Design a protein around this ligand. Sequence first.
Ligand code: HEM
Length: 293
Amino acid sequence: TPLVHVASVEKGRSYEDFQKVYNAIALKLREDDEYDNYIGYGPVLVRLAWHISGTWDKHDNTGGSYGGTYRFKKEFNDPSNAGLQNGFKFLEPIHKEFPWISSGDLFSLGGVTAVQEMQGPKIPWRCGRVDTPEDTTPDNGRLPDADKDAGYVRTFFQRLNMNDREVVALMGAHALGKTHLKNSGYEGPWGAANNVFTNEFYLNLLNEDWKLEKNDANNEQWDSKSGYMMLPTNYSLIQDPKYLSIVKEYANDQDKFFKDFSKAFEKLLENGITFPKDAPSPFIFKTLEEQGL
Ligand code: HEM
């Protein structure tokens, strides 16, 4: 009925093989520091791990990270994926170095790596995604719009099986990077620490004096005097009572946020995958720093 995507470990690889890919990404992150005005590739990699995952449809089990379908033109040229080509190029050389790793596994590890190296929480990760054929590539239009309200958000995330808690946690990734006019029709950073993983997003939402304004692309965005921006979908989080209570909690406790995020992010990345009982347990990779590298 609904596809069944069973995880299949890359033949003969163990934990140590994966830690080597991680370190490779990590080391390149450290070295290519000038990207986007010295933000680095951290943020775009996280966005890439979410975009390849965010196409999942719990109704027929199509999309998601399994297939590494972003490799195909259709998914690659999705207007919602504009700008991701930069994370793609960053990863190419690594792929060329470890050609045995599947695409889905690589794109998803890039995100875990980015988060952990940006001082975020540890995100357990599972290997086993298997490249699927060009024809399993989902149509464009499954990624969310930025100009909607909390109702849109709630409904949308439901398709990915995410509840309110998971939604607000995941949304905290909007502390990282920035919007780029040419990519999305939005411009500006979210906050001040744009390449360190913190609960900044929640604080900025609660504490700034947001003004609604139209940008150069004729889109509306919430602008603050500190020079930050919020998309309408971001802002809607304080418009909803249920969401707002969760925003406060995360504003108040970064620890809680980091725990919830971790869980939600793994789930996101594992949606649609069936893990057999003999499948290795999730891996927890060490950071460069933990390894003295
Ligand atoms: C309602 C859901 C979401 C919407 C509408 C949304 C929309 C956007 C937009 C329009 C951009 C700007 C891209 C650009 O102009 O380069 C952006 C950036 C970003 N998004 Fe989302 N996003 C959503 C959820 C998420 C989630 C779940 C994550 C990961 C947990 C995420 C991570 C990021 C990051 C890290 C960036 C910054 C990228 C960079 O600096 O290149 N977003 N988002």
